[PDB]
Amino acid sequence: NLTSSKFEEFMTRHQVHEKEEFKALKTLSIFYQAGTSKAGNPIFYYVARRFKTGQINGDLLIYHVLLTLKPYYAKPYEIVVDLTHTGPSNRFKTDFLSKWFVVFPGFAYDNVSAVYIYNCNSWVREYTKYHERLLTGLKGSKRLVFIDCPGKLAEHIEHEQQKLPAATLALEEDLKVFHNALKLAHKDTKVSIKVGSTAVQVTSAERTKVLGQSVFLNDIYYASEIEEICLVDENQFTLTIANQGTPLTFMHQECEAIVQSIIHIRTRWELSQPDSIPQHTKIR
């Protein structure tokens, strides 16, 4: 017996404005409004990789999202979802994922004009497949728009109005592209490794079906997550990532040149961290 009105009433009396954990949600900037699109509707951003799946009460996030939509959700609006560097540590669960469908007034769902998903990656696609039963409503919908490059965003949201997180923008500068590479797995597929100053981006060069739509799957591995860099052969090199299990092996004509480039970034981070040395070793 849960509806949009009871949830709204419950939070109000269960006062949360002075919790000192509801305030931090604003500074963290998980959900905020910025700019307007060509059609003239306001645009809201959702930074997906700022939510830790077990550190705050889930109901607080819903209330914060709701409280910033009341003045606007009576008319059409648009949402930009930023999935940069999203992983299993910031997922929703079935108990908490199904709440999002039964908490807002029924017309709030209809006013959503379009959705712009940004920087999808492999984990998200697998996450969608597992929960495909719930997300059947979104299957094949025409309101989902997938962005392939930052330039395409200009068409829908005009430049000088887009406000993405400062971190997200920094991940598209000083790039060192290596086109035509190939990824070695159970089923290989073209990729294009890029090695910026801070992190390594494995941008797939082939479109794949996500929620019934073809799209590219860009993946980002940060320096701190890089553990092993080796060159088995000039044809192939292998990378090991923390907590990801099996290492990733790729084939390129100049793997040694690419392998050298990654080492430079890793070495600089080693100097960057001030801590002398960690204590003990984690074993699984």
Ligand X SMILES: CCCCCCCCCCCCCCCCCC(=O)O[C@@H](COC(=O)CCCCCCCCCCCCCCC)COP(=O)(O)OCCN
Provide, rounded to whole angstroms, the least separation between the CB of residue 249 and ligand X: 28
Instruction: Please report whether residue 62 would count as binding ligand X according to CB under 6 A.
Output: no
| Residue selected from 72, 92, 146, 269 as contacting ligand X according to rule CB under 6 A | 92
Output the residue with the shortest Cβ distance to ligand X: 137
Query: Segment near ligand X (CB under 6 A), from 34-42, 97-105, 230-238, 251-259?
Result: 97-105
Instruction: Please report whether residue 65 would count as binding ligand X according to CB under 6 A.
Output: yes
At 189, the amino acid letter reads T
CB closer to ligand X out of 98 and 253: 98
- For residue 137, what is the DSSP state? G
| Residue selected from 4, 56, 99, 104 as contacting ligand X according to rule CB under 6 A | 104
Helix 58-67 vs helix 4-13: crossing angle, to nearest 10? 100
Instruction: Please report whether residue 60 would count as binding ligand X according to CB under 6 A.
Output: no
CB closer to ligand X out of 67 and 112: 112
CA 91 – CA 94 distance, rounded (Å): 10
Nearest to 211 by CA among 134, 281, 102: 134
115-174 positions binding ligand X, by CB under 6 A: 115, 124, 127-128, 137-138
Strands of the chain (E only): list them: 31-36, 42-47, 77-82, 112-118, 144-146, 177-178, 182-184, 189-195, 199-204, 208-210, 213-215, 218-222, 226-230, 236-241, 248-251
CB closer to ligand X out of 107 and 282: 107
How many CA atoms within 13 Å lie on the side-chain side of 30?
Answer: 19
CA 83 – CA 210 distance, rounded (Å): 14
What tokens does 212 get? 């019934």
| Residue selected from 34, 112, 205, 251 as contacting ligand X according to rule CB under 6 A | 112
Residues in the chain: 284
Instruction: Please report whether residue 100 would count as binding ligand X according to CB under 6 A.
Output: yes
CA 227 – CA 152 distance, rounded (Å): 34
Per DSSP, the three-state class of 135 is helix
Provide, rounded to whole angstroms, the least separation between the CB of residue 279 and ligand X: 34
| Residue selected from 109, 155, 180, 188 as contacting ligand X according to rule CB under 6 A | 109
CB closer to ligand X out of 66 and 171: 66
Instruction: Please report whether residue 81 would count as binding ligand X according to CB under 6 A.
Output: yes
Binding pattern to ligand X, positions 221-240, x when CB under 6 A?
--------------------
- For residue 159, what is the DSSP state? T
Interface positions with ligand X (CB under 6 A): 46, 48, 65, 79, 81, 91-92, 100-101, 104, 108-109, 112, 115, 124, 127-128, 137-138
